[PDB]
Structures are given as C-alpha cells and as structure tokens.
Write a protein that binds this ligand. Structure first.
Ligand SMILES: Nc1ncnc2c1ncn2[C@@H]1O[C@H](COP(=O)(O)O)[C@@H](OP(=O)(O)O)[C@H]1O
Ligand SMILES: Nc1ncnc2c1ncn2[C@@H]1O[C@H](COP(=O)(O)O)[C@@H](OP(=O)(O)O)[C@H]1O
Ligand SMILES: C[C@]12CC[C@@H]3c4ccc(O)cc4CC[C@H]3[C@@H]1CC[C@@H]2O
Ligand SMILES: C[C@]12CC[C@@H]3c4ccc(O)cc4CC[C@H]3[C@@H]1CC[C@@H]2O
Lengths: 280, 281
C-alpha cells in the first residue's frame, strides 16, 4: 500500500527505507571542499550532474561517480558509505529540503547548486517515475497523482515549500540557483555561468565539448547516464524509460482543462510572496 | 523465457549477467593468503561461510564480509570490485567448477575448502531457490525441474561433473573436501577439523562458541546471515525463505517413487567410478 511504503518524517513524506537509519545522515561529516547538487525530484538532476562532472575533469555509472547522499536499501545500497570512501573533491547529490540537509554542510560553508523546473512539467515526469519504480504503487490515474502533488503527499513532500526554502538560502553568494528551462533555451550561457561559479576559465573548447556531450540525444544513448546500469528488477524502463522526452510543455498532453485551471489557481495562492523568476 | 535468462558458456549453463563481462573474472588477481570456499548451489555455503568467519575472528551482511566472486548485475552488484577493495586476508565465495575458476588461484597455490551435499536433497533446495529469485522463471513442476537437473541444464551445470572434478582436486593437501551431512551429524568433529586446517588452536571455549552461534535456529534469526538484508524485489522470501528447513532427507517429501528410481539409476551410471564417501542415511 502507498502508506506502507511512505511515511511522514518531520513534516515531509519519505520512503521509509531512507529514514530507517536517519542517524547516519544527520551526523554526516562534511569537508570544506564538498560540492552539493540539490533538486526536487525530476527537475534535471542527471543533466546538470554530468555538466559539473565534466567541468571538474576539464564509464562508471553516474550514481557511482556522484553518490546519492540519503539513498539507502539495507546493506545493498548505501550512499553515506560510498561518500566516506570517496576521495576529495567530492560531488554530493541530494533531494532534501534545507531543514533536513546535514547541518555540517552549512557549518563548513560548502558551495551548493540548486536546480528547479516548472511545476506542471515536474508533475508529468514524476508520474511516470512512479510507474518505473517497481516497489512504488502505480497511481490509479494522472489526475489522482496531481491531487496528491498539490497536497505535498508524494515522496520528498511539497514542491512549493522545497523551492521557496532553497530560494531563500540562495541569498548566499555560495549557493547558486538555476532553472531547467534556461538550460533548454540558452545552454551556452548557463554552462559559462557554472564554470565561473566553480572558479575556472571558460574556454570555447571546454564549453563546446560539454554542450556536445550533454545533449538529450547523447545522454539517452550513454549507458553511464541513462540508468541501464541499474537492474530492471528495481527500475523497469520497459514500462517507462529514464530519458523520456526531455522537452518543455508536456503538461499540455496530460492535464485536462478543468484540472489545469485548478492547479494554476492553487499555484498562485502558494507562490504569492515568492520572488523567484521562472521563464515565460 | 528460460533460455533468454540462461546460456551455455564453455559447456556450462550460466546466468548471462555473470558471463557478459567474463574477462573480469578470467583475469582476476589472487593473493597468496586468499582462502576459497567453493560449493555447488544450495549445499550449505552460508553455513560453512559463517563458521570460517568466526574462526578468523577467534570467537554487516555476510555477502559483504565474504564477497561472491562471479556475482554481477551491471553496476549495482559487482563481486570482483568488492574483492579488489577488500583488505587481506580475503575470504572468497564461488559456485564455479574447477575449469572456470580464475587460473591465478591455482598459480598461487591458495588454500581452498569444497563442500557437497547428497544430490536428491540438493535438487529439492535448488527448486525452491528458483521460485525465490524473481528474475528466474518458475519451474512448471518439481519433476520437470528434476529432468533438467539430471541433464545438467540448470545454472552452474552438471552436479555430477562439479563434484567429480573438485574431488580430484582435493588430492592436494591444500584443498579440503567436506560434507553437509557430516556437519549435521557430528558438528564438533567438523569444527575442530576446520580450525586445524586454518592453523589455529581448537580450544574448548572456541569450539563451543562456534557451535552455538551457527545452529540453524540462530542463523535463521540472524539478519546478517538469513539474507533479509537483500531486497525482496530481487529475492522474495515471502515465496520461500532462505533458511528453509535445514534437514537431511526432504527428498522423501518431493520425489514420487517412479522418479526416485530413475534418478538413483542415473546417479549410478554417472558416479560409478568415483571414490567419494557420502554418509549413509
Ligand atoms: N540532457 C538532457 N536534456 C534535457 N532533458 C534531460 C536531459 N537529461 C535528462 N533530462 C530529463 O530530466 C528528467 C529527469 O530528471 P532527474 O534527473 O532529476 O530525475 C526527465 O524529464 P522528462 O520525464 O520530462 O523527459 C529527462 O528526460
Ligand atoms: N546453520 C545451518 N544448519 C543447517 N542447514 C543450514 C544452516 N544454514 C543454512 N542451511 C541450509 O543450507 C541450504 C542453503 O544453502 P546455500 O547456503 O548453499 O545456498 C538450505 O537448505 P534447505 O533448503 O534444504 O533448507 C538452508 O536451510
Ligand atoms: C533505491 C531505489 C532505486 C533508485 C531510485 C531513485 C534513483 C534516482 C533518483 O533521483 C531518485 C530515486 C527514488 C527511488 C529510488 C529507489 C527506491 C527503491 C530502489 O532500490
Ligand atoms: C544477483 C541476484 C541476487 C543474488 C542471487 C544469489 C545469491 C547467493 C547465491 O549463493 C546464489 C545466487 C544466484 C542468483 C543471484 C541473483 C540473480 C539476480 C539477483 O539480482
């Protein structure tokens, strides 16, 4: 059952396998040069993760090169253990809201990159992800999933609270805030911005290489990034592939008119006092 | 389909996920002090693995403490990688027949322990294991599974060829040959023998600690050894538990009379000239 798999932890709905040993995450020891990549699920984490890795490097699965902090499935999968054995400088992936991130990261003043995507398109991507994950109950319908999304009753909680809290943290010059739609409409600009934030020289050669290797077509056929290195028993891509469409606007093919009006109205009430600038 | 999952490799039927990157196994680098624990599937590997580990520690999931050499599932599970990162002295688990084991192990003259169990009881245990593994097609019936077993058309091939080849290897004083039924009927004797082979003192305190910790009842309740640390999506124990019965003679509850006669007759022709001494039961 849905609520046998997921349960509220400190006001955030979470996969119980990731909170059973919460102590390991809360007491995590950060290093001054650690870099944190944070996102709400299905906002382009894999895309920006590969861009940053390439920058660091001017085959092994991406989930091995950049460990997923809080991911845990008893003794078979353990992100914390992977990080303890990782040589510096480490790149750390996470989907946690600011109130749940290990305090050591703030204490040590580590650099961080937060990426977001428009809410309607995130909901479409998340719906298919639940179908893909074998141990996650399939929603009875897209609409039923959207009602849960609006209530923040999906893994990692409310998208609204997630974006608002990370936007506030981005007041800090060491926390970079970025958008999926900006990477889609002006990739060269976003890559140069990332190279500069990480204190490196943006050369035409480096910038072109990254733009070339990180296209959706490129990443969909790279076994290291398309998640085919992860067993079908856990993630069945026969049901739905990880690199699905990679576009802006798929909400137009899933949201009936009545539902869209209610969602957009709800969005307004939620994001009233937030200054974040999403692309038109 | 059965043969979409399994394929013959150098005359041995194998899970294709374990042979896709065979080069990683063939070129494996052994160390002089490595210890190899080899068995045909479902013969008591987990039981003897825990006994040996306890000996090393003189009184974390078992698949992490003692890596399964050839086990591989793309980038999620990789026994070779685990071993490269393991501090010595390493304990290595494997289900491979002698002709498929990495040659480096023979070149370095490493010590090894081989364990076997009577064929009829192994077939019963193996049948339930296929039901347990989610990605393995469930046999249509026990009899159909037995026909495949007699033909060597099950993962890791012919049980007959496996036992005969390892028995020949045991001529070497550094390769110990043992039986599941001997551990069941005379555990203290078998434990003292293992402590001595690994060059340690079989004190009364030590022997007694091992015997109590490795009973079927204890291990069935120990999350480290009962394979509950492995996701149900891969191994569903709701279908059949890993620590199933742990007895001698369950074949009597599965083999119809007609089938048993044919199996035993076939066994005779396969093992006619083998001097191996199985226990009377
Ligand atoms: N190089 C790339 N360019 C564009 N979209 C990409 C991409 N790599 C991944 N994506 C998209 O990012 C989403 C997955 O996000 P995450 O990595 O956070 O889980 C998917 O969205 P869609 O389901 O809409 O296709 C996927 O197709
Ligand atoms: N401490 C113990 N004592 C007796 N049998 C044990 C045991 N631990 C495991 N077993 C048995 O060993 C078999 C599993 O073997 P392996 O470890 O090689 O996969 C199972 O046989 P059954 O299915 O007949 O019960 C299991 O119950
Ligand atoms: C860890 C699992 C595989 C990886 C899955 C994943 C992988 C990547 C990601 O960004 C989010 C998630 C959420 C659910 C995870 C799954 C829960 C059960 C499964 O074993
Ligand atoms: C590696 C798997 C889990 C562990 C299983 C195992 C575990 C222990 C063992 O002695 C043999 C086997 C054979 C099949 C394996 C399975 C094949 C698919 C699954 O992911």
């Amino acid at each position: 059952e849905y609520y046998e798999v997921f349960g509220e932890f400190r006001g955030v709905l979470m996969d119980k396998r990731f909170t059973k040993y919460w102590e390991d995450v809360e007491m995590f020891l950060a290093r001054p040069d650690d870099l944190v990549i944070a996102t709400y699920p299905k906002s382009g984490t894999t895309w920006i993760s590969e861009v940053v890795y390439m920058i660091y490097k001017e085959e092994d699965a991406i989930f091995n090169r950049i460990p997923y902090l809080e991911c845990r499935n008893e003794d078979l999968i353990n992100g914390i253990k992977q990080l303890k054995e990782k040589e510096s400088p480490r790149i750390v992936k996470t989907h946690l809201p600011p109130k749940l991130l290990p305090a050591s990261f703030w204490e040590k003043n580590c650099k961080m990159i937060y990426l977001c995507r428009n809410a309607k398109d995130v909901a479409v991507s998340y719906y298919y992800f639940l179908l893909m994950i074998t141990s996650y109950p399939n929603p009875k319908s897209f609409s039923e999933f959207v009602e849960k999304f609006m209530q923040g009753q999906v893994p990692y909680g409310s998208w609204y609270d997630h974006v608002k809290a990370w936007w506030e943290k981005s007041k800090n010059s060491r926390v970079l805030f970025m958008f999926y739609e900006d990477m889609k409409e002006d990739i060269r600009r976003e890559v140069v911005k990332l190279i500069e934030f990480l204190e490196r020289k943006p050369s035409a050669e480096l910038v072109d290489r990254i733009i070339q290797h990180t296209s959706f077509q490129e990443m969909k056929n790279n076994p290291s990034t398309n998640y085919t290195m992860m067993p079908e028993e856990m993630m069945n891509q026969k049901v739905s592939p990880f690199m699905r469409k990679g576009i802006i606007g798929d909400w137009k093919n899933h949201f009936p008119e009545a539902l869209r009006e209610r969602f957009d109205e709800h969005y307004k009430q939620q994001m009233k006092d937030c200054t974040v600038k999403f692309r038109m």
